[PDB]
Design a protein around this ligand. Sequence first.
Ligand SMILES: *C(=O)[C@@H](NC(=O)Cc1ccccc1)[C@@H]1N[C@@H](C(=O)O)C(C)(C)S1
Length: 640
Amino acid sequence: TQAVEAGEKTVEQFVQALNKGDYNKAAEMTSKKAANKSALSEKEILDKYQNIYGAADVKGLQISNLKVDKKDDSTYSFSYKAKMNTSLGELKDLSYKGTLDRNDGQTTINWQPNLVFPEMEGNDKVSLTTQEAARGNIIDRNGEPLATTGKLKQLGVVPSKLGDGGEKTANIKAIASSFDLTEDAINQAISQSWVQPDYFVPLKIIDGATPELPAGATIQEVDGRYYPLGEAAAQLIGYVGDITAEDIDKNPELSSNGKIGRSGLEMAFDKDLRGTTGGKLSITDADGVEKKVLIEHEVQNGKDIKLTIDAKAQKTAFDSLGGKAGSTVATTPKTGDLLALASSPSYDPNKMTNGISQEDYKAYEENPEQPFISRFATGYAPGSTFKMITAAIGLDNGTIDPNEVLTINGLKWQKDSSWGSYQVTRVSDVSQVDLKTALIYSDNIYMAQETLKMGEKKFRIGLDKFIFGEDLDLPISMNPAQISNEDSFNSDILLADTGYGQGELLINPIQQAAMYSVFANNGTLVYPKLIADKETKDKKNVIGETAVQTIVPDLREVVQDVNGTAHSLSALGIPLAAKTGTAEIKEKQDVKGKENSFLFAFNPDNQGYMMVSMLENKEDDDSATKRASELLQYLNQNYQ
Ligand SMILES: *C(=O)[C@@H](NC(=O)Cc1ccccc1)[C@@H]1N[C@@H](C(=O)O)C(C)(C)S1
């Protein structure tokens, strides 16, 4: 019992060496190459573990139920049970054994072939057969293909079949012109280091119709991941990439000859879409004689995933942005089904997963407008659209009277002289301003005064009833919305700015569509829902039904009144309640000052659809309201 404590330490740090991937240090703990001692030499153990554990991708060796006893003068036999993770799953209830040798003060392990796998004898071998699982598709709310694995048409060139001299140079340009490609890229692809005279070197992928084939234009049909919408759903869906040797080290259950999701839903749902690798891990002997099977299970394909996205609304919402920086969120506000999650500018997913020239990948990483960003998940300042929330709070606590008319003179205003030179500004010079007039002309001075009148304490009481600080249940990485940096404004100026959607507010378009969903459910907040089978979670009594019955009729006038900020939408001739708004951004990249246009709109008759569009760093005379008539028409007669 005095040396058994050091004997259990020997088995403890031996399994730790195997579990740490260091087989050399694990071999140094064995005895000497003899009949009853260790059965192999030093490097003979290193090569035995590395070839077997490396082939099956063995990682995570845990042991339990140790029992170290005695038998002879130095033969203290040990036995335990272990578990490990391989390419085909987890090995459980592995009964191990062996003996020890405690000569002097160094207790070693009499190594035996049963220490690699339980039922391995003298010179036994291990074999692994695996069949990769097909990746499941991603479908929309109507079963349309958003991310399937289909057949593609390739285009490559063989350097020998290009001619026999100067004819190759002319055809290198004839192939570049017949398929719209760079002539310098064809002669560069055929002159790489790995290129051989008769090797089929690929080029680009034919999108559909195959043009005339010049002097050697082989079209080898290949299979790969295909995204039918392309850039329209690039940020949402994502892209898959080839699996690296360092990826298998983290999760050994991945097929090294397969694809892994790198961003978006392809990554957030990688476990459900890749399936499980099938095959058999058996122990053989001599000439592949199947002795004992360790693991063997059938191949399971990936589960298809149905979203709440409308493929037609996703493409229309993206195309309406015209390639400018922005995003659009369209939902069914009574259930939360996100019908479209567009972001612009965007990248090409089919180009990323099917091989992209590194010059073009630098264009996406160095693009100032950042096409990789999912702008529907990026927190912004909500802008003038946030006055709906501030007004609804003011009506609930009785601070704002819908019929009380404030008298505002000029375009600038400040509470006292303690504000220095800062003044709340408004665009229109209306003298008599009530709640109806302030929401039509988008008056900041009215909301600023009614916010200071409301008080900081009473303001947050209504704000805390929303989703500020909450993390929504969506497979989209985002930060929770915040009222301010700290839990206290500690500034009258900051309180007024937060009244009309400025200050230290950060709300992403998905969270905005959730907070604004109360105006379509009579004060009940409906959480957004991306997976089609998810339940409809809601949160009632956020604002009173009285404030909804007061603001919603006013939001109709933002469209119908001749001086409304969203009057251009009255041309649609459909029932609409909207609320526009810009937002000042003082980014230090330039001394100008970028501003972001916003737009919120929904149908007040049936509450069938709700839309939140925005334009980041908008161009002059451009607005989200201008480029919203297209999908507002679609959402009107398709989601009533
Ligand atoms: C709401 O965000 C308001 N805008 C501002 O406070 C900043 C601003 C930016 C550019 C010009 C003027 C003022 C008002 N809402 C928007 C809108 O509803 O589009 C206005 C441009 C009417 S100012």
